[PDB]
Amino acid sequence: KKSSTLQQLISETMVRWAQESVIEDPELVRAMFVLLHRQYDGIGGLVRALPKTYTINGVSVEDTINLLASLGQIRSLLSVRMGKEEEKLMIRGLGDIMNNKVFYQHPNLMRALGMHETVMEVMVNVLGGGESKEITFPKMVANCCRFLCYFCRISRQNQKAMFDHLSYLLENSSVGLASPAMRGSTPLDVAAASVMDNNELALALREPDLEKVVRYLAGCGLQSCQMLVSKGYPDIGWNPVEGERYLDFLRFAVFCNGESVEE
Amino acid sequence: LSKKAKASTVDLPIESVSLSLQDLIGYFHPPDEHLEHEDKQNRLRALKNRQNLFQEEGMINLVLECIDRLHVYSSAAHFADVAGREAGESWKSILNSLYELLAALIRGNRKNCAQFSGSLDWLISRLERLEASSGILEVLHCVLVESPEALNIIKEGHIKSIISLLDKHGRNHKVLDVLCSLCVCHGVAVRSNQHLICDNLLPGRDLLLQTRLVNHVSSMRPNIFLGVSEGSAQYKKWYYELMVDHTEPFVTAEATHLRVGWASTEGYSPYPGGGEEWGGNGVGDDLFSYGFDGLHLWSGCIARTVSSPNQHLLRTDDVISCCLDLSAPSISFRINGQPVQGMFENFNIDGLFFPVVSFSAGIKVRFLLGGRHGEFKFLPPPGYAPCYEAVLPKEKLKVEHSREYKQERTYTRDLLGPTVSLTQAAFTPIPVDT
Amino acid sequence: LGVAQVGRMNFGKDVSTLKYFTICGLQEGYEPFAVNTNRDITMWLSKRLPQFLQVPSNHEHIEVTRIDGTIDSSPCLKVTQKSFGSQNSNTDIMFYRLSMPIECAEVFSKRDDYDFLMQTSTYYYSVRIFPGQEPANVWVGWITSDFHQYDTGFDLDRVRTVTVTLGDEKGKVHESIKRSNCYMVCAGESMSPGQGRNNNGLEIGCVVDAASGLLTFIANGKELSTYYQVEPSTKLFPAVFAQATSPNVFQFELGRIKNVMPLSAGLFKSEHKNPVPQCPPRLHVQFLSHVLWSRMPNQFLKVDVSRISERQGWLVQCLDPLQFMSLHIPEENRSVDILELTEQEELLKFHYHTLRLYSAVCALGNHRVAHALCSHVDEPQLLYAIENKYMPGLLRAGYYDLLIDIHLSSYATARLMMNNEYIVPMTEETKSITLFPDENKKHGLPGIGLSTSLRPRMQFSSPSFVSISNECYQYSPEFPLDILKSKTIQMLTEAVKEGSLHARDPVGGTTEFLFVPLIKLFYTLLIMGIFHNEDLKHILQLIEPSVFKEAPKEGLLQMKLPEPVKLQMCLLLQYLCDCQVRHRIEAIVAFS
Amino acid sequence: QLILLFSRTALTEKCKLEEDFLYMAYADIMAKSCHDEEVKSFEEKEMEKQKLLYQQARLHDRGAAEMVLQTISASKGETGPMVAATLKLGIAILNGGNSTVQQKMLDYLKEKKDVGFFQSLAGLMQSCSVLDLNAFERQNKAEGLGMVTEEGSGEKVLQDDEFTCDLFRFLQLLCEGHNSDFQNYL
Amino acid sequence: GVEIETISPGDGRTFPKKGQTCVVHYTGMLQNGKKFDSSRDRNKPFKFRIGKQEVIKGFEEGAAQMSLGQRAKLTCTPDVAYGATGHPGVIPPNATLIFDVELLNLE
């Protein structure tokens, strides 16, 4: 009889194709079965979509569209490889986000849009493409770290969302610690902002996460800084400059709101 | 051998190396498509493990050393002169097998293709040689496809060398595919490589095939078959006119074509010679036709700007008068009665001439052939006879397409074989000698 | 067909036209050759005008070998007759040329020194006539692309020439230009001492001054009297016309002489400053031949001619425009209709990969490269490729890809990235949105309706190169989107109607080439959101007439489609489902 | 076709078993279909058993038993949603000690000589979590200070008790009915 | 350095000044014969204002010398047309440009 509904039409068509012919293309098989599952589980579409739904006032429409365009420009940079022009685009794109008023008034919207994951992914791309070979494009990494720290300071929920990425950041702690004029702009600083002044997050912080920092500090206390001795600094066996940053992070992990987290 | 030892003293296992290279190629041969999925996956896993073990024992650098030490000899003749005639015979085969082995060792293995980054620069340095071009290209393609890290070392020099490979070795889609892989790898676009490839390949317009829209151009001529010959009852001077009732400068994005003049036929065949039957060509686009467009004299697809009072491209209500003198080869034009200040001279006269107009869409021209058929507005120059006077007594003067085929239903379309020569057009009396 | 023979070939596209089919063939069951074709069958005939093509390796008469240049020897290409001394050998003159031209300067000016070699533009090649080959039967010189003469008796007097004489208003000839396709000399006459070819092979050396267009010839170390002057921008191909009187005919030598830079420097741009002679694989001997085919156009210009009156003369009128897309081979200075690539497999494949490279260089939001590519591939060419029904499938699939990537890909991918995130303003227009259009709980047609959710802006930049500002590189180049949408709907409708009969002549050669590129463009346009209301209704009716009728014919869903077409149809259905979900989300927000 | 696609994806060699939403959904659908679920009579209990056998045959006749082994083998001992739902599907098709499914599973393993299956089983067992008193103390301290618990059940302590129970239930169903062959083969 | 050759006559009295948007159709081509741009291909007239270097200097001078309704050929040397650096991807270095320009309308 009459289907009269796109749902029933698709549910009939996928099954008809599958029963008519043996599909050779695995991508086609996935496509048809994804469509069939979507038709049958209609409520699941709402379950997935509603968390991504946001309502804004009519007066904020233009500012929200500008911020959405900026976020799209930042997102498109994932598809391209890191370069000078991409660094400039990323920098002024982040600048527009800070300047926009919607960024502060609607932190839940930004967390739902998942800007911090995108900035993280760009930083991961850079550290993969130039961590061991000394941090290339350091300015954009610094800007990303500053943006992420400001994201932590905007709202307490954003702080938890950022703390959920602590494990990677602690593994990329040794990015630009020994290089001054970049203080407050390394992934270790971002981790400190993630676990700064939040009792819940400090308690939730695990022992292996502290163990990573302790191991880094042990390495810095045992061996000198290769980049400094390359610049020609007198070679003392240990590294104070890198060690101090890890000490600061440990301080922020152990001490919170004037109280000392005993655990 | 390079240290100049005697061939007898030198132990050169040519046949053993060739057979071992064949066995290694068979060993690293990729799985076939007919195989079932599970078996294909098993073969793929086995090949991956073999490649891993080989590269961990450092079999890639050994192949590279063999290839490098073999390239010192310029050619098979040179290698034969150095070592021996079997060595010269098998030198190219050994190089090709070595390159194939390297490609098989690094294909589909990201770790190996990443370790090959250091040698990539040395690899591209021998791409110019015909002894190794195909193998080096295949190895480069495999590395670029497999390893993202490979792209980060490709600089302007390497891209320029790859592009110059097209200019030196001719068109080859494999170089194009390598250039494409240099643009986007694993869903990531390298903008620097994109810009370099664009700016180094596209602007030249000398390697890639070029495309353009060309307006269809048709040619129209009367029946008359003016000609010149010794001892032939034909009059050497001729004259006709064409008036453009209407013409649109731009019917389409391209400029409208409208040219008028004379065309010749190769030999005495009635078929016009030297030009395409259909296409964008017309009067003056070949060395058998002679045209005028109001500003340019056209011949051999070459246009020369010719001066005239009130210069303009052929417009509405323009009368062009064409004069032909075969006694001294001369084609002259006069626009609206004013004389055009250029003329064709000393053209080949071993053929039959006829008036012709070439055009694209948007013309309303009218042939004024003189006399009863057309009425000349400007009187012919002295001597020149109007073109209608060359019609044979039986035949009738009509304007028909220069070429055989025309727009009509396919099943009605007449297919014509070669035409017979029209030597009878020139009546040269041949009396029996007495 | 022979001399003066006329015939017609009926493929039976219209069965009634076939006059004798019924009495013989029909009951037997033989079918008309064009029984199930919606397009006229393209016809290929024997080319009248000979063209130059590379000497085949399997040629039974002419063999060409490449002699590499040693330290003391220049590179050589040796032309010899393998059939010499055997039965059925051809005693005819053959016309050989090199595959690449020397290009004269655009504007003509008004131990050898290395600096002189660097600054000079004169180029040299030579021809060694092997001793015993009658040099009177050998001609050496340069020819242009226009040379299409295969007279068995060749002489320097028959060469086609003209003299354009331009004079002032008074009539005094201020200039005269001689134009000819052939600029060659004969070795027999170049034997000024006589029997030069006897004691040793005769050497004719051709030198061309690309800066001034002077062509001169030196035989046995002395400059011959005959010289030529060519007009600027002429492309001259090295050429030898020889009637073989010996097993070995002649040898192209690409060497160099005092103060003259060799031929490879002039030919290749990379070696413009390389004194060393070279013979790269691109250079090869090409012989004039008639073994080529030619494609008749499917449609010709409609021209009407008639004698208006005795005074009016004859009238020739043409008012309907037609165009063909011409593919230009750069090195040969030739041009062929792109539809002729249906039988030239190598050019078809190379051009398909060139199109893929065009897509790749502008892929992923490279707007500046897209603007640059708009120069090479214009929007009229793109639209003609859109609409043409005879284009090869590979070229069709490549050209739709270019049309998508240069103009539509950036906005399409922006919309796809912003697809799954619904930010909806809370405004009076948003308040009106409801799940069901009326009291009857009947679903509205997907897509049609008022959607207020925030959507990325669509901005395009005009691709003009006379402008100087670089900001125009930002944004994808503009395209006639309305015309593109109308043509897409029209072609989809026609394709559905044709494929409903399963014709033997799909556009592009296969159902995949007919539908996959068309549906890809249609899906990209739908993703961007150009389609509006009534157009969306028509395309939905094309998709399925039964479900989407507003409250015999079969939609695309049930036409026994190939797998690649099925995948894109699945994508279309996914987009429709996403539209439904967005409508639901907006209705929930409106109720909120 | 769906089961064959899921089997081919598992059999394709990758360094890690990528999470697939399609498998996440359809494995759950198939698992629910099998069970399709106060005294009852003998006849109706036997009818339920017969219905469950037919609903399990609807899947294990089409390669589900092999697919739920291949997915576990490709898991390479990494706890995740994919193996978490593969275990549920295996339990669903193996409920009641299905001897046909047990025989199919044992025959497939013996024929393919799959060591990865048992290596992944051992890896999953090692990855299974247990009670963590330190996490419990931290959770209690958070409540004492007064921050609202994101999770009320203390899911940090005993991270995934469903996965461990499903794994050991699968391993038990593999041997129910006193299947000596599979008992020894384990 | 710009050469003007009239293909079609204009009015002969109206010429572009300060403050006027010139509306043209141009069919710019290289010297070899290959076409690299056409506002008629794009089907939209090109509008540019005089004296503020929106266009190249050769085009500017040619349009200044041209009159209303006049079609002319503009030959521009490299020194007034994109210089020696050229236009990356479109115009090669040191290339003279031939433009077929029609001045349709002036405000």
Side-chain angles (χ1 to χ4, degrees), chain B residues 344-385:
Chain B
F344 300 99
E345 282 303 84
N346 301 114
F347 44 78
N348 314 76
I349 62 171
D350 57 11
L352 301 170
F353 288 77
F354 56 93
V356 58
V357 63
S358 50
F359 52 88
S360 81
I363 73 153
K364 209 189 288 315
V365 298
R366 270 203 291 109
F367 268 91
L368 283 69
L369 289 155
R372 286 184 50 273
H373 280 285
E375 201 263 338
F376 285 145
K377 293 184 183 293
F378 302 100
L379 60 85
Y384 294 92

Side-chain angles (χ1 to χ4, degrees), chain B residues 130 166-173 176-177 179-180 183-184 187-189 191 194-195 197-199 201-202 205-216 220 251-252 264 266 271 274-275 277-280 286-288 290 297 299-300 302 304-306 309 341-348 350 359-369 371-375 397-399 401 404-407 410-418 420, chain C residues 1-10 17 40 43 45 48-49 146 149 157-169 175 179-181 231 268-271 278 280-282 294-297 299-303 305 307-331 338 347 349-351 353-354 356-358 360-361 363-366 368-369 372-373 375-376 380-381 384 399:
Chain B
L130 200 53
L166 290 173
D167 171 63
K168 304 274 291 313
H169 285 45
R171 318 182 219 287
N172 186 23
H173 60 278
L176 278 196
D177 280 330
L179 280 165
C180 296
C183 296
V184 175
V188 177
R191 292 275 188 82
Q194 276 179 351
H195 291 322
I197 290 155
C198 181
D199 298 337
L201 182 60
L202 284 186
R205 298 159 205 251
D206 60 295
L207 295 190
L208 304 176
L209 307 164
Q210 314 289 316
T211 50
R212 185 178 178 179
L213 291 180
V214 184
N215 281 42
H216 267 279
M220 294 299 291
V251 59
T252 68
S264 87
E266 192 142 32
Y271 166 65
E277 295 179 354
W278 52 84
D286 57 354
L287 263 175
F288 290 73
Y290 309 99
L297 293 186
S299 177
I302 300 298
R304 299 294 295 164
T305 302
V306 62
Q341 305 149 53
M343 62 173 37
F344 300 99
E345 282 303 84
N346 301 114
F347 44 78
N348 314 76
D350 57 11
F359 52 88
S360 81
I363 73 153
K364 209 189 288 315
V365 298
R366 270 203 291 109
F367 268 91
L368 283 69
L369 289 155
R372 286 184 50 273
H373 280 285
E375 201 263 338
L397 180 58
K398 65 178 71 66
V399 180
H401 287 76
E404 290 83 3
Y405 311 102
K406 63 184 289 294
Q407 175 55 56
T410 62
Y411 71 98
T412 72
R413 179 174 291 171
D414 290 332
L415 309 162
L416 281 73
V420 68
Chain C
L1 300 192
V3 170
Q5 304 312 315
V6 179
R8 301 181 175 111
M9 291 205 320
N10 214 315
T17 63
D40 289 330
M43 191 145 288
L45 54 83
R48 276 192 198 264
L49 214 52
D146 192 54
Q149 290 84 28
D157 292 331
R158 190 259 302 161
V159 300
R160 308 289 312 191
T161 180
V162 67
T163 299
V164 177
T165 50
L166 311 164
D168 70 329
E169 186 84 65
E175 73 176 298
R179 184 172 309 121
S180 178
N181 53 24
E231 65 183 1
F268 302 83
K269 306 142 183 89
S270 74
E271 317 304 303
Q278 286 175 19
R282 203 163 172 207
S294 164
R295 174 182 192 273
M296 281 175 28
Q299 186 177 1
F300 295 91
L301 269 188
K302 277 181 174 321
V303 186
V305 295
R307 202 142 65 111
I308 307 297
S309 71
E310 279 279 314
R311 299 281 76 78
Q312 280 283 282
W314 287 80
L315 187 146
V316 175
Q317 174 194 321
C318 179
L319 283 195
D320 305 68
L322 291 175
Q323 286 181 355
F324 75 101
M325 174 175 32
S326 63
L327 188 148
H328 177 108
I329 299 103
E331 65 182 2
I338 196 165
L347 293 176
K349 187 174 177 67
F350 185 68
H351 198 58
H353 283 106
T354 297
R356 286 172 40 88
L357 180 51
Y358 285 1
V361 292
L364 294 185
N366 205 327
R368 177 195 88 80
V369 173
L373 280 153
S375 178
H376 306 271
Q381 313 181 26
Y384 171 82
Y399 274 119

Side-chain angles (χ1 to χ4, degrees), chain C residues 43 95 524:
Chain C
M43 191 145 288
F95 310 83
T524 294

Side-chain angles (χ1 to χ4, degrees), chain C residues 51-56 59 62 95-96 285-289:
Chain C
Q51 314 282 307
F52 279 104
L53 59 87
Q54 177 173 359
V55 182
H59 202 253
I62 315 157
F95 310 83
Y96 309 97
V285 180
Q286 287 178 321
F287 81 115
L288 189 64
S289 159

Side-chain angles (χ1 to χ4, degrees), chain C residues 382-394:
Chain C
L382 281 159
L383 280 172
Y384 171 82
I386 296 302
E387 190 180 2
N388 196 359
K389 279 169 41 91
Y390 292 92
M391 191 95 57
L394 276 191

Side-chain angles (χ1 to χ4, degrees), chain A residues 55-178 180-248:
Chain A
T55 301
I56 58 168
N57 276 325
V59 298
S60 306
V61 162
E62 185 68 26
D63 268 7
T64 304
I65 300 182
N66 307 317
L67 188 147
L68 277 178
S70 179
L71 180 47
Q73 281 145 5
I74 295 148
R75 275 196 204 150
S76 75
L77 294 175
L78 288 173
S79 289
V80 301
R81 187 178 293 276
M82 246 335 340
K84 300 294 187 291
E85 68 269 60
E86 290 84 3
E87 171 168 40
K88 178 272 161 184
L89 299 173
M90 207 281 299
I91 287 168
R92 88 290 184 276
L94 290 185
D96 310 319
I97 301 278
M98 319 288 255
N99 285 4
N100 216 331
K101 264 301 152 182
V102 181
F103 178 64
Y104 315 107
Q105 292 177 357
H106 307 252
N108 308 78
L109 171 60
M110 313 299 167
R111 196 182 332 123
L113 291 174
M115 314 165 40
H116 62 277
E117 286 88 4
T118 302
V119 172
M120 204 93 70
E121 288 180 354
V122 187
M123 204 176 54
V124 179
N125 294 339
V126 177
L127 303 177
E131 173 67 28
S132 179
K133 310 162 292 293
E134 209 290 334
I135 309 303
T136 184
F137 315 120
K139 182 65 72 176
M140 61 79 71
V141 170
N143 286 283
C144 284
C145 283
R146 272 177 223 111
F147 177 76
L148 287 185
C149 282
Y150 199 38
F151 195 66
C152 294
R153 291 176 296 233
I154 290 300
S155 77
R156 187 174 180 178
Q157 294 82 17
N158 287 352
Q159 186 177 2
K160 300 178 181 67
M162 187 66 204
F163 174 79
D164 310 320
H165 297 273
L166 179 80
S167 296
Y168 152 75
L169 285 169
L170 274 178
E171 197 274 329
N172 293 49
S173 71
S174 65
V175 165
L177 297 196
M182 184 177 177
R183 176 164 310 91
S185 306
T186 62
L188 185 81
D189 315 311
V190 178
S194 308
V195 72
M196 185 180 288
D197 296 316
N198 199 318
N199 290 318
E200 183 177 1
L201 298 174
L203 293 173
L205 188 152
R206 297 297 96 193
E207 302 89 52
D209 291 331
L210 290 171
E211 179 59 75
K212 292 187 287 184
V213 189
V214 170
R215 267 180 272 104
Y216 290 138
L217 181 60
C220 301
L222 289 167
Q223 195 40 249
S224 197
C225 193
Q226 298 300 109
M227 183 278 288
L228 299 181
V229 301
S230 310
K231 291 192 287 183
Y233 278 101
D235 176 47
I236 60 170
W238 66 293
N239 197 350
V241 186
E242 277 209 80
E244 195 258 348
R245 309 296 292 162
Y246 295 116
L247 283 162
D248 290 332

